[PDB]
Nucleic acid binder design. Sequence first.
DNA 1: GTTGGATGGTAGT
DNA 2: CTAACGCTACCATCCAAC
Length: 341
Amino acid sequence: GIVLFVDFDYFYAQVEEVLNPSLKGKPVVVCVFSGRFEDSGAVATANYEARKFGVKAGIPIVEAKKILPNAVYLPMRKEVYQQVSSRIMNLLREYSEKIEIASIDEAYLDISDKVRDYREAYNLGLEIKNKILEKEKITVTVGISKNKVFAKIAADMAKPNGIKVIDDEEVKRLIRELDIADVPGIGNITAEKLKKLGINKLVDTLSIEFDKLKGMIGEAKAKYLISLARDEYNEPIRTRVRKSIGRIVTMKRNSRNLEEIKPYLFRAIEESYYKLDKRIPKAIHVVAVTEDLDIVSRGRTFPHGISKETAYSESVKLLQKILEEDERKIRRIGVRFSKFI
DNA sequence: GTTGGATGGTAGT
DNA sequence: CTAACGCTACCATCCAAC
Ligand SMILES: Nc1nc2c(ncn2[C@H]2C[C@H](O)[C@@H](COP(=O)(O)OP(=O)(O)OP(=O)(O)O)O2)c(=O)[nH]1
Ligand SMILES: [Ca+2]
Ligand SMILES: [Ca+2]
Ligand SMILES: [Ca+2]
């Protein structure tokens, strides 16, 4: 079983560099402007030149401009990037039909019926890098291993414009030596909990009672870590089915005034329903980000599908419910559809 | 004692 | 207005309904 994972380099910024080669070789920062005030919002990504200065995905645009004033700041055009992504995804498709698209910029290929071993895998990975570079002028990072998790870990180790194989012996070693925090799915919270039990490496999970481990971090997370640690994790490549779709927007200013909020909510509904496109949801949730950035939410599941008209009516009821049961001012408002038929 | 919908926490973006 | 997008996925906990 061999899995080939491709993850495009500084994707949004790189697309813009391809669309405008004069940008190449300079700091570039792609931004999600919230509309709230001048330069309100956060950064989607930035190129490696910008990262040298601390500018990276997630930080506030005002933090970016503070530490890197003279960079080029462009707004995010997701649709433009999505078009390039789909074209690349189809190139990937001509090397393997067995493909898992995980984000706008990455995908997992099962290549066990195309290559004999890790060498031929690596050569395929160089072939794939070349093709994407010729056809779209995008550089990507390939990670090859016996499974999805390790293909992703391998890519992470080789980022910008690399390629890396983690073969079976290195898996054994990484199960022993890789800091547990560096395992996909273990964030800050879960890392702390694993330190309190003195569990620092994947191998440390095989020397602890299942029941004691599941109590601390949860059943699913325990079964995941133990499975990895046993060298048994083997989730296969499967087409991803979108489970939920929605839209959230930042308001020009905080409010508890229904008539002031409604317009934003109704925009979120229209654009959500456009993104649904054929799908019929049975569950709707209204999501509100309060003045102190806490996320609160009210929803409802129907026994049948939700029509646009019901989405308008219920979302208003749900938003009324949030205002009734929570006293803080609202700052962002959104909606989310799930349980598709 | 067991389902699953409502709500929220954690993760990776 | 004065920092903190916009998104998706998965799972834990609560607690009325079984
Ligand atoms: N809005 C938003 N978009 C993000 C965020 N993180 C990543 N993205 C978008 C922009 C990225 O170009 C694209 C792919 O993200 P990646 O996580 O793979 O990082 P990126 O390609 O930008 O740099 P790379 O060398 O992987 O690290 O997804 C984020 O926090 N917010
Ligand atoms: Ca990625
Ligand atoms: Ca990337
Ligand atoms: Ca971590």
